[PDB]
Amino acid sequence: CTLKSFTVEKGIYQTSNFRVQPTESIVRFPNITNLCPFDEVFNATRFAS
Amino acid sequence: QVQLLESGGGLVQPGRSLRLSCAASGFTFDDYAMHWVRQAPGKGLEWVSGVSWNSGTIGYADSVKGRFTISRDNAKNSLYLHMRSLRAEDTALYYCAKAVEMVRGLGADPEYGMDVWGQGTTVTVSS
Numbered sequence: 599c600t601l602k603s604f605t606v607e608k609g610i611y612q613t614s615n616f617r618v619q620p621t622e623s624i625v626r627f628p629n630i631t632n633l634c635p636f637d638e639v640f641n642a643t644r645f646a647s
Numbered sequence: 648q649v650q651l652l653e654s655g656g657g658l659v660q661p662g663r664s665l666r667l668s669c670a671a672s673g674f675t676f677d678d679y680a681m682h683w684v685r686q687a688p689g690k691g692l693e694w695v696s697g698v699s700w701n702s703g704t705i706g707y708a709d710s711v712k713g714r715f716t717i718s719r720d721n722a723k724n725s726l727y728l729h730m731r732s733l734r735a736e737d738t739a740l741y742y743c744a745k746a747v748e749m750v751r752g753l754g755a756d757p758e759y760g761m762d763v764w765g766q767g768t769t770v771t772v773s774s
């Protein structure tokens with residue numbers, strides 16, 4: 599297929615690409631410590647007028 | 648230093664309005680539930696009204712319910728007390744006090760501990 603012919607002469611030919619495939623995915627980020635103070639808004643004891 | 652300055656006093660006839668103002672300076676005004684407490688002349692104290700950290704009022708005194716109207720403003724650090732149906736029995740000093748426990752610092756949210764007190768005004772009514 600690479601030579602675009604059916605008769606191939608004696609010799610060494612370089613054809614294609616060997617490339618090992620990935621296994622899975624990885625995502626990294628440190629311990630999530632900051633947190634928006636939402637509860638104080640929704641869970642407040644008394645809302646304004 | 649923490650400062651609580653109130654203004655609005657002066658003789659007004661019965662059946663009018665007034666608008667007392669308390670301004671706070673020296674702390675994060677949005678983590679402290681304010682209170683307005685009267686002080687009759689030569690008598691004991693008497694709770695009047697309050698307001699929580701989120702501008703939500705916490706009810707008024709039983710004998711005053713119907714006229715007083717509290718309001719807050721965190722942007723200008725200002726708490727206001729509109730007063731209606733003024734009658735002779737409403738002459739007294741008025742302090743604006745602040746709570747102690749900062750909100751979410753430990754069950755429920757805090758409202759006790761009137762610790763810092765400004766020097767009150769001298770509202771009076773007569774004809």
Ligand SMILES: *[C@@H]1O[C@H](CO)[C@@H](O)[C@H](O)[C@H]1NC(C)=O
Pocket residue numbers: 629
């Ligand atoms: C972040 O969480 C991991 C997993 O619970 C823990 O091992 C680590 O001690 C935490 N953060 C640090 C670096 O203390």
